[PDB]
Amino acid sequence: KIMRGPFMKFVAHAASFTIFLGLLVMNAADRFEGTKLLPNETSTDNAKQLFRMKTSCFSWMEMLIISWVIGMIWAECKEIWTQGPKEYLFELWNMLDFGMLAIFAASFIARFMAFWHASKAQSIIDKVTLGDNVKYYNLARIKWDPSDPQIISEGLYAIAVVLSFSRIAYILPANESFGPLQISLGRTVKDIFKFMVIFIMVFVAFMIGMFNLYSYYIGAKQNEAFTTVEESFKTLFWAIFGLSEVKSVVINYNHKFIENIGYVLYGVYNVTMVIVLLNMLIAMINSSFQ
Amino acid sequence: IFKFMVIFIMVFVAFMIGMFNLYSYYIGAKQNEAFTTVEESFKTLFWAIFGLSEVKSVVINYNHKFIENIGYVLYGVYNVTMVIVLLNMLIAMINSSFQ
C-alpha cells in the first residue's frame, strides 16, 4: 500500500532509470584505461575458435540492456494504443524518445546478425590455411569491410547512449530548483529555431559560392577544403567555433585572383555570421523582459 | 552558475560516455589519443569549451568512414548544445540582475 502511492511510484520509476544509466556506464568498464585489444592484434582466448567469435558474443551486462530496451519498447507501445496514435505525436519529446529506442533496436539487430554470420561460418571450421568461406573471419579490425554489421552496431550504440541521457527531462520538473531551469532552457530553443532559418540561408549561400570557386583545384590545394560539398560544408560549419584555419583558402598555383576571392568570401562569411549571432543574442535578451 | 553546472555536467557526462563508447576500439589506429581512455575523452570535451581541441581528434586512419561520420556529428552536436546552454545561462544571469 506504500508502493501504490504516487511518490513511491515516481521514486521507483526514477530508480529504474538510474539503474539503466549505471548499466550503460559499467558496460564498457574493462576499457576505462585502454582496451588491451589492438586493432591490428588478434585474441582468441580458446586456441580453437575464430577471432570473430569472442567479439560479437553477448556478455551478462549486454543482455540486461536488451531486457531494459524491450521493456521500454513495450511501455511505449502500451502508451501508443492507450493515448491514441494522433495525440501521442503531439508532443515532440515522445518522438525524441521513440527515436532512441529505434536506434537501440537497430544496433542490437545488427550485432545479432553479425553474431549469426560468425556462427554460421564457425560451424564449418569446427596453424594452417583456411578456405574462402571462413577466410574473412579470424581477422583483425584493420581488414574488416567498411559495411560490416559489427561497425554499424558500434556506431548506432553511441548515438543511442547519447540520446538515452535525455530522459532526465521526465524526472527533473518534480524539483523546486531544476524545474524552472528546464522551463527557461526550453523557452530559448524555440527562440533560436526561428533564427536558424536565416543562419542556414547564409550558410547555404556561402557553401555553394565557395564550392563553385575551389572545385577545379582538388589536388592543387593546401588541404582538402571547399572541393567536395561535404568538405565545403564542414569547413564552414567548424568556422563558427573558430576551428577552421585560414590555410584552407590557399592554392599552390600562381592564380592569386582566385585565392584573393576566397580570402574575401571567407572574411565576409565570418563577419556576416558574427552579425547574425549578435542580432540573435540581442533579440533573445530583449525577449525576456517582456 | 552553481545551479547551471548541473545541466552542464549532465550534457558533459552524456557526450563523454557516448564518444568513449564509439572510439574505444581504435586506440592505436587514430590520428591522436583522444576519446580512447575516459580521461582522454574527458579532457577532449573539456578543452573544447575554450576552443582548444582540434577537429583532427575525430579522424581514424582506417576506411571505416561510418564511425568517423558518427564522431563528426556527435562532436558538432556537442558544440551546438554547449553554446545553447552557455547562452541560456548568460541570458538568465542578465535577467536576474534587474530584479
Ligand SMILES: CCCCCCCCCCCCCCCCCC(=O)O[C@@H](COC(=O)CCCCCCC)COP(=O)(O)OCCN
Ligand atoms: C550582413 C552584412 C555583411 C557585411 C560584410 C562586410 C565585411 C567586409 C570584410 C572584408 C573582408 C577582407 C578579408 C581580408 C583577407 C585578405 C584580403 C586580401 O587578400 O586583399 C584583397 C583586397 O581586394 C579587395 O578589393 C578587397 C575588397 C573587399 C570588399 C568587400 C565588401 C563586401 C586582394 O587585393 P590586394 O592584394 O590589396 O591588391 C594588390 C595590391 N598589391
Ligand SMILES: CCCCCCCCCCCCCCCCCC(=O)O[C@@H](COC(=O)CCCCCCC)COP(=O)(O)OCCN
Ligand atoms: C539542445 C539542442 C541541440 C540541437 C542540436 C542540433 C545541431 C545539429 C548540428 C549538425 C552537426 C553536423 C557536423 C558537421 C561535420 C561533418 C558532417 C559529415 O561528415 O556529414 C555526415 C552527414 O550525415 C548526416 O546524415 C547528418 C545528419 C545530422 C543530424 C543531426 C540532428 C540532431 C556524413 O554524411 P555525407 O558524407 O553527407 O553522406 C555521403 C554523401 N556523399
Ligand SMILES: CC(C)CCC[C@@H](C)[C@H]1CC[C@H]2[C@@H]3CC=C4C[C@@H](OC(=O)CCC(=O)O)CC[C@]4(C)[C@H]3CC[C@]12C
Ligand atoms: C551513473 C551516472 C551516469 C549518473 C546517473 C544520474 C543519476 C544518479 C541522477 C541524475 C538526475 C538525478 C535526479 C534529479 C531529480 C530528482 C527529484 C527529487 O525529488 C524531489 O525533488 C521532491 C519530490 C516532490 O515533492 O514532488 C528526487 C531525486 C531525483 C529523482 C534525482 C535522482 C538521481 C539522478 C537520477
Ligand SMILES: CC(C)CCC[C@@H](C)[C@H]1CC[C@H]2[C@@H]3CC=C4C[C@@H](OC(=O)CCC(=O)O)CC[C@]4(C)[C@H]3CC[C@]12C
Ligand atoms: C554589393 C554590391 C555593391 C557589389 C559588391 C562590391 C564589389 C564591387 C567588390 C566587392 C568584392 C570585390 C573583389 C574582391 C577581390 C578581388 C581580387 C583581385 O585580384 C588580385 O588581387 C590580383 C592578384 C595577382 O595576380 O597578383 C582583383 C579585384 C577583386 C576581383 C575585387 C573586385 C570588386 C569587388 C567585386
Ligand SMILES: CC(C)CCC[C@@H](C)[C@H]1CC[C@H]2[C@@H]3CC=C4C[C@@H](OC(=O)CCC(=O)O)CC[C@]4(C)[C@H]3CC[C@]12C
Ligand atoms: C532525436 C530523434 C529525432 C532521433 C535523431 C535523428 C536521427 C534519425 C539522425 C540524427 C543523426 C543521424 C546519423 C549521422 C551520421 C551517419 C553516418 C553515415 O555513414 C556514411 O556516411 C558512410 C561513409 C562511407 O562508407 O563512405 C550514415 C548515416 C548516419 C548513420 C545518420 C543516420 C540518421 C541519424 C541517426
Ligand SMILES: CCCCCCCCCC(=O)O[C@@H](C)COP(=O)(O)OCC[N+](C)(C)C
Ligand atoms: C542529446 C543531449 C543529451 C543531454 C541531456 C540533458 C537533459 C536535459 C533536458 C532539458 O533541459 O530539456 C530542455 C530541452 C527543456 O525541455 P522541454 O521543452 O521543457 O520539454 C519537456 C517535456 N517533458 C514531457 C519531457 C517533461
Ligand SMILES: N#Cc1ccc(O[C@@H]2c3ccccc3C[C@H]2N2CCC[C@@H](N)C2)cc1
Ligand atoms: N503511473 C505512471 C507513470 C510512469 C512513468 C511515466 O513517465 C515515464 C518515465 C518515468 C521516469 C523516467 C523516464 C520516463 C519516461 C516516461 N515515459 C512514459 C510513457 C511514454 C514514454 N514516451 C515516456 C509517467 C507515468
